[PDB]
């Protein structure tokens, strides 16, 4: 069963931080124009942080000081390299940065 990635719509005023919770290497992805994958961070650009909670299975994926260009689509995925190449991806969530 894949990880969850919530909230599905994250409404944040620009300048505030935004944190998704990924509950499941663990990658945080942003879907670009041309709908291709960009890796923002991994567990284990300074504005995209991943914090493993004491829970161990939950992770906070945070945008520090969200800008309007940060608006887009995001997800998390867990990769197992072997035996058998496997990825379990979350459903896609949207970051909606609004004007202050």
């Amino acid at each position, epitope marked *: 069963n894949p990880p969850t990635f919530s909230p599905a719509l994250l409404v944040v005023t620009e300048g505030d931080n935004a944190t998704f919770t990924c509950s499941f290497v663990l*990658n945080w992805y942003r879907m670009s124009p041309s709908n291709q994958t960009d890796k923002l961070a*991994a567990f284990p650009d300074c504005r995209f942080r991943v914090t493993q909670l004491p829970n161990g299975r939950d992770f906070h994926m945070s945008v520090v000081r969200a800008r309007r260009n940060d608006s887009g689509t995001y997800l998390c995925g867990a*990769i197992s*390299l*072997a035996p058998k190449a*496997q990825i379990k991806e979350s459903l896609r969530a949207e970051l909606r940065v609004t004007e202050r």
Partner: antibody
Amino acid sequence: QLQQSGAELVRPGASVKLSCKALGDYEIHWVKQTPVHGLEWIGVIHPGSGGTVYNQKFKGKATLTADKYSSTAYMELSSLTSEDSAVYYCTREGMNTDWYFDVWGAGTTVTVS
Amino acid sequence: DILMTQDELSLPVSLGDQASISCRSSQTIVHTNGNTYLEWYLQKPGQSPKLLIYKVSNRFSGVPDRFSGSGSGTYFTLKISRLEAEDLGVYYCFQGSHVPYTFGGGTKLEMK
């Protein structure tokens, strides 16, 4: 397709780096072939994360890397001996597929003098 | 490590004959997810290996149905009914259920 680099002619004790360009999510595997030892799985890299898993028999002998801004994977062979003279294939495994190696490179031959 | 042992090194045939290639694994090869990643590859002379059968018995896309795979536990078999010239080469079994992945030593199907 997987396009492999040209034949290598190298001396004992040296190192050589082979490349594999993916044309046209996956993991990239390397396989050695010799008449006496057959086909041997060397290891795998996931280019997106850089993660690797090695066959312990090839730890130290082979180092797998992959570029981030080109679809190229590499295998560096070190401490070369006549036992390393062989054909080396790169092959691909799709994420979340039911099978392994449906696409293979043509192989790169290494000859240790 | 799992050792994959093929029963015969060579099989001399005539075109149109039946061929059977068997492979014994030293341990069972069921992945933790329940699938058995037992595969058969054909390496035609001077070519790279090509995937014929995956998950024991499934033909890869485009592989003709004269090829069939069966087996379970530690014994797996590829059968070629009425073999054609394009079938000549070396057949290798392969397990990808447990790291490190391992291949059989090959069985060469050649003209008798």
